[PDB]
Amino acid sequence: AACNVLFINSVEMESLTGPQAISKAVAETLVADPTPTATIVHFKVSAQGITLTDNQRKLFFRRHYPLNTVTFCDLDPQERKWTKTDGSGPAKLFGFVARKGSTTDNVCHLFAELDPDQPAAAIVNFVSRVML
């Protein structure tokens, strides 16, 4: 299945992981300078993992995260929101932690819900059931 969401930022977490990693990535993202520029992306969940593709204007073209590299996915533990460099109000933040040549190093990829019928909690639950 594929959902439409806003890709917000990717943060190097070293060995941090789990909810601590998601929360830390959110904190770093909200004070990043300049403010990261969000991009509308196709967030596809499959037996192969998570594949992100442009559904905006090609910032990046495509990124694929093999299922075995995804170790965690959840909403921001502190329930902070993304105020899109735009308007339409605050959007809930969520992300996933991926290991992927750094064995113990992780990266957290952050997103914001965009479609009312595809809320962050539902996306997190689907990824969890299929990949974690």
Q: Domain range holding 46? A: 1-132
Contact 85, 131 (CB under 8 A): no
Please state the domain count of the chain: 1
Alpha-carbon distance 22 to 26, whole Å? 6
The reported resolution of this PDB entry, expressed in Å, is 1.5
Question: Which domain CATH number covers 8?
Answer: 2.30.29.30
Alpha-carbon distance 21 to 63, whole Å? 20
The pair of three-digit structure tokens given for residue 59, joined into one six-digit string: 């910032």
Cis amide prior to 34 (ω within 30 degrees) = yes
Q: What residues are paired with 108 via a beta bridge? A: 11, 97
The pair of three-digit structure tokens given for residue 17, joined into one six-digit string: 């992981």
Q: Distance from first CA to last CA of the chain, Å, rounded?
A: 16
The experimental technique used to determine this model is X-ray
